[PDB]
Design a protein around this ligand. Sequence first.
Ligand SMILES: O=c1cc(O)n([C@@H]2O[C@H](COP(=O)(O)O)[C@@H](O)[C@H]2O)c(=O)[nH]1
Ligand SMILES: O=c1cc(O)n([C@@H]2O[C@H](COP(=O)(O)O)[C@@H](O)[C@H]2O)c(=O)[nH]1
Lengths: 218, 219
Amino acid sequence: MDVMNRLILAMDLMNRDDALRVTGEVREYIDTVKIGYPLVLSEGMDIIAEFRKRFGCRIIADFKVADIPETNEKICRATFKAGADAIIVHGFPGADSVRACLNVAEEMGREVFLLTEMSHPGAEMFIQGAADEIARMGVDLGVKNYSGPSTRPERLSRLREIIGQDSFLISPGVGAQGGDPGETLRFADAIIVGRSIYLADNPAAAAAGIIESIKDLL
Amino acid sequence: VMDVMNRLILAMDLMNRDDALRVTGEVREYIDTVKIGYPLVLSEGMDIIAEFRKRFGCRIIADFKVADIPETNEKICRATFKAGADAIIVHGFPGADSVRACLNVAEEMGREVFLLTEMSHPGAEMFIQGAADEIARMGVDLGVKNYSGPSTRPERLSRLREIIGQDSFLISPGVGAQGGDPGETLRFADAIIVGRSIYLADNPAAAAAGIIESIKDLL
Ligand SMILES: O=c1cc(O)n([C@@H]2O[C@H](COP(=O)(O)O)[C@@H](O)[C@H]2O)c(=O)[nH]1
Ligand SMILES: O=c1cc(O)n([C@@H]2O[C@H](COP(=O)(O)O)[C@@H](O)[C@H]2O)c(=O)[nH]1
């Protein structure tokens, strides 16, 4: 997956007008948008097609899929029907639940991103202790796309070690949560950035600024 | 705690509005509490909650297995309660801050959180099972009053009931299609969740009535 400027916009605004306006303002800097439940549950799954129509960006559906296999399959089918190119799936619920998503993605020509360790403080309680094993499970299952935490570069580096240089790794927690763009890109292929861009006085300038700070990494 | 008619919650995971409405309407005399998850919501929109309330007047549990960072969890809960859900199901494995974010919105909006502890499917044994007792204890410490645990593992369901105490409300999926027994599950759970055994039946109303007949002495 070739992500422009190694930068994925986390579009978590919850109003269609604002989400479209802000995304349009930064469109010259990105070609990949992560759309999650804040926007989808506020404006409907049709928002995905609207983004494709307006911006011709790739869309990652950040749905943190975390159900039993049968339900996971249904969620993935509905998500890909809406035009998402990829979906983010939790590894913590186990291998059968991940495989269910992999199967639908294969059937529909899409990608699964396996979320190993999360970026927020609560991730330390249960997820962190399982994360290396979740990553190995990904490798065993043939997963090629992963998410790990910008807020813990030593953990992000370990995840990169487990999955190898050929796998694709994206990383949230940059900016608002404390992660550094350049340090994160030592290990991740692409950074996810939400609030530092979409809550900025000038989102275009914010995106341009981040890209300037990593210009040697492009 | 919510008064679930017949101790039976319908997991409405059909993905078409017409079928979902038909089946729910057919079992309405037996069930006043419906769990609506992402299979239906992602297919038909959040307005499906509005339509269920309008048509059936059933309580709605939004089964969204909320599993994000605190800031995103808050947004998800706000959107879900805005649409009219009575309650939302939240994962505990992402930790206490993520759960607290959901509790804070539920408190502000006058709605409820259900904390998902252990899950019912085989994969739950890999990571969730080993964290589940602590997730439940965390819930108790945070003031969580509503929980979900697995019908498919009676020994685990019993332990989770012990941890949360008799006053907490416990619902349990995995009954029927996944192998759990209604009566045995109700030894520990306040209510059972049933999906496919009802909604894939030739006669969903007869399926629901049959389940209820089998647990009549527990009502
Ligand atoms: O570990 C993770 C995984 C995520 O998907 N995310 C998501 O990435 C985005 C981070 O946005 P922000 O840059 O505003 O912190 C949010 O959409 C959040 O749901 C995260 O923050 N941490
Ligand atoms: O541990 C759990 C938690 C759940 O919410 N569920 C949900 O409960 C329902 C089970 O439906 P069924 O009776 O068709 O197996 C599904 O909606 C599933 O997503 C589960 O099966 N196991």
